[PDB]
Design an enzyme around this catalytic site. Structure first.
Site, short mmCIF file in Angstrom:
data_model
loop_
_atom_site.label_atom_id
_atom_site.label_comp_id
_atom_site.label_asym_id
_atom_site.label_seq_id
_atom_site.Cartn_x
_atom_site.Cartn_y
_atom_site.Cartn_z
N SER A 160 -70.31 40.91 -81.94
CA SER A 160 -69.07 40.30 -81.46
C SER A 160 -68.37 41.18 -80.45
O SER A 160 -68.22 42.37 -80.65
CB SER A 160 -68.12 40.11 -82.64
OG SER A 160 -68.67 39.20 -83.58
N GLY A 161 -67.86 40.53 -79.41
CA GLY A 161 -67.13 41.21 -78.36
C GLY A 161 -67.98 41.80 -77.28
O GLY A 161 -67.45 42.17 -76.22
N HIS A 213 -61.14 38.17 -81.58
CA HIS A 213 -61.34 38.25 -83.02
C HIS A 213 -61.77 39.65 -83.46
O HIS A 213 -61.83 39.90 -84.66
CB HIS A 213 -62.28 37.15 -83.53
CG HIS A 213 -63.74 37.45 -83.46
ND1 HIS A 213 -64.58 36.91 -82.51
CD2 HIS A 213 -64.53 38.18 -84.28
CE1 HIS A 213 -65.82 37.30 -82.74
NE2 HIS A 213 -65.81 38.09 -83.80
N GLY A 244 -71.33 41.83 -85.79
CA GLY A 244 -71.41 43.16 -85.26
C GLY A 244 -71.77 43.22 -83.79
O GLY A 244 -71.53 44.26 -83.14
N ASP A 274 -61.26 33.39 -77.01
CA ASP A 274 -61.64 34.56 -77.81
C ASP A 274 -61.96 35.73 -76.89
O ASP A 274 -63.12 36.09 -76.66
CB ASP A 274 -62.82 34.21 -78.70
CG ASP A 274 -63.14 35.29 -79.73
OD1 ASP A 274 -62.34 36.23 -79.88
OD2 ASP A 274 -64.20 35.18 -80.43
N1 LIG Z 1 -74.53 34.01 -82.09
C1 LIG Z 1 -74.18 33.85 -83.35
N2 LIG Z 1 -74.86 33.03 -84.12
C2 LIG Z 1 -73.02 34.59 -83.88
C3 LIG Z 1 -72.58 35.77 -83.27
C4 LIG Z 1 -71.49 36.45 -83.77
C5 LIG Z 1 -70.80 35.99 -84.88
C6 LIG Z 1 -69.58 36.70 -85.40
N3 LIG Z 1 -68.39 35.86 -85.27
C7 LIG Z 1 -67.79 35.30 -86.31
O1 LIG Z 1 -68.06 35.55 -87.49
C8 LIG Z 1 -66.76 34.23 -85.96
C9 LIG Z 1 -65.35 34.81 -85.78
C10 LIG Z 1 -64.74 35.33 -87.05
C11 LIG Z 1 -64.98 36.63 -87.48
C12 LIG Z 1 -64.38 37.13 -88.61
C13 LIG Z 1 -63.51 36.34 -89.35
C14 LIG Z 1 -63.27 35.03 -88.94
C15 LIG Z 1 -63.88 34.54 -87.80
N4 LIG Z 1 -62.77 36.86 -90.43
C16 LIG Z 1 -61.93 37.92 -90.38
O2 LIG Z 1 -61.85 38.68 -89.42
C17 LIG Z 1 -61.04 38.08 -91.60
C18 LIG Z 1 -59.59 37.99 -91.18
N5 LIG Z 1 -59.09 36.58 -91.02
C19 LIG Z 1 -59.35 35.95 -89.69
C20 LIG Z 1 -59.52 34.42 -89.90
N6 LIG Z 1 -58.52 33.87 -90.84
C21 LIG Z 1 -58.59 32.40 -90.95
C22 LIG Z 1 -59.19 31.66 -89.77
C23 LIG Z 1 -60.66 31.36 -89.96
O3 LIG Z 1 -61.14 31.19 -91.08
N7 LIG Z 1 -61.35 31.23 -88.81
C24 LIG Z 1 -62.75 31.13 -88.65
C25 LIG Z 1 -63.67 31.39 -89.66
C26 LIG Z 1 -65.01 31.14 -89.46
C27 LIG Z 1 -65.48 30.61 -88.27
C28 LIG Z 1 -64.55 30.36 -87.26
C29 LIG Z 1 -63.21 30.61 -87.45
C30 LIG Z 1 -66.94 30.29 -88.08
C31 LIG Z 1 -67.89 31.47 -88.29
N8 LIG Z 1 -69.27 31.01 -88.45
S1 LIG Z 1 -69.96 30.92 -89.89
O4 LIG Z 1 -68.99 30.40 -90.80
O5 LIG Z 1 -71.21 30.25 -89.72
N9 LIG Z 1 -70.26 32.43 -90.36
C32 LIG Z 1 -71.25 33.36 -89.78
C33 LIG Z 1 -70.59 34.71 -89.52
C34 LIG Z 1 -71.61 35.73 -89.00
C35 LIG Z 1 -72.78 35.87 -89.95
C36 LIG Z 1 -73.44 34.52 -90.19
C37 LIG Z 1 -72.43 33.51 -90.72
C38 LIG Z 1 -67.87 32.42 -87.09
O6 LIG Z 1 -68.81 32.47 -86.30
N10 LIG Z 1 -66.78 33.17 -86.97
C39 LIG Z 1 -58.70 34.48 -92.16
C40 LIG Z 1 -59.60 35.69 -92.10
C41 LIG Z 1 -71.24 34.82 -85.49
C42 LIG Z 1 -72.33 34.13 -85.00
#
Ligand SMILES: N=C(N)c1ccc(CNC(=O)[C@@H]2Cc3ccc(cc3)NC(=O)CCN3CCN(CCC(=O)Nc4ccc(cc4)C[C@@H](NS(=O)(=O)NC4CCCCC4)C(=O)N2)CC3)cc1
Ligand SMILES: [Ca+2]
Length: 223
Positions: free
Chosen positions: A177-178, A40, A175, A84
């Site tokens: 991530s990865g 991601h 941030g 991922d």
């Molecule tokens: N240990 C931890 N607690 C931790 C550590 C690291 C992270 C960081 N990793 C995340 O953010 C990952 C992965 C991710 C990242 C970015 C996007 C989508 C996903 N968007 C883009 O890139 C834009 C481009 N495009 C890609 C995706 N397309 C559609 C598909 C889609 O909607 N899929 C998706 C969306 C959301 C999730 C999973 C899959 C769940 C989400 N969780 S959440 O809702 O609660 N929000 C958190 C985010 C961090 C701050 C606190 C709230 C999550 O985690 N997501 C369209 C968009 C988080 C937590």
């Protein structure tokens, strides 16, 4: 990293920063030519920054190397976040020293209860946004698959594990991530996802690297 501490300069020598004009994700150096990160985190034009502590100050141990190619796992699903993981090849080899060093890949999966080191330059605030200058670290245990699925019913695949603290307060975050989850000297996890950061009953979810070792080794050998 929420609820962590300052690692110390170059004390996590396999930690890299992925930069696209600004830091946006972490990664882990696995040999002089290859970095493991999250699928991601894919972007075009990544510059890998090795030897970093303060990512906003030039301290004299940095190596800035462009990615020459990225290989995102072919089975990555951007909805479920299954698989991922991505491999980044460096345009030229990193120079390895005490401050820039590879991390070993696992020969077996880690067990629930093992303490791991999670690191990165991601958000340090659970209820807001605050990005650090220097690298932050967190010690966190692998949680049982049962408690992981209890926190995230239906959402956890065999390619994921939870780590952290059900009480909240200590977690990785955006941030990070990865970047690495290192347990017993081996790269066992990649910072992947979670519900918020450092929230009660919502631990971090990490890509389970031990499932991918043969894929990693064959991919880096062939490419
Ligand atoms: N240990 C931890 N607690 C931790 C550590 C690291 C992270 C960081 N990793 C995340 O953010 C990952 C992965 C991710 C990242 C970015 C996007 C989508 C996903 N968007 C883009 O890139 C834009 C481009 N495009 C890609 C995706 N397309 C559609 C598909 C889609 O909607 N899929 C998706 C969306 C959301 C999730 C999973 C899959 C769940 C989400 N969780 S959440 O809702 O609660 N929000 C958190 C985010 C961090 C701050 C606190 C709230 C999550 O985690 N997501 C369209 C968009 C988080 C937590
Ligand atoms: Ca620096």
């Amino acid at each position: 990293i929420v609820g962590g501490y300052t690692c110390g300069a170059n004390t996590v020598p396999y930690q890299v920063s992925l930069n696209s004009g600004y830091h946006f994700c972490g990664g882990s150096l696995i040999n002089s030519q290859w970095v493991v990160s999250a699928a991601h985190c894919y972007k075009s034009g990544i510059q890998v920054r090795l030897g970093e502590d303060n990512i906003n100050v030039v301290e004299g141990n940095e190596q800035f190397i462009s990615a020459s190619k990225s290989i995102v796992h072919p089975s990555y699903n951007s909805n479920t976040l299954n698989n991922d993981i991505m491999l980044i090849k460096l345009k030229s080899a990193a120079s390895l020293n005490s401050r820039v060093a590879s991390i070993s890949l696992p020969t077996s999966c880690a067990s629930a209860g093992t303490q791991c080191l999670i690191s990165g330059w991601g958000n340090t605030k659970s209820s807001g946004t605050s990005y650090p200058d220097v690298l932050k670290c967190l010690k966190a245990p692998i949680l049982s698959d049962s408690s992981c699925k209890s926190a995230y019913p239906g959402q956890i695949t065999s390619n994921m594990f939870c780590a952290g603290y059900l009480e909240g307060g200590k977690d990785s975050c955006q941030g990070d991530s990865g970047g690495p989850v290192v347990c017993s000297g081996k790269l066992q996890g990649i910072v992947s996802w979670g519900s918020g950061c450092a929230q009660k009953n919502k631990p971090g979810v990490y890509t389970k690297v031990c499932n991918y070792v043969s894929w990693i080794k064959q991919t880096i050998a062939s490419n």
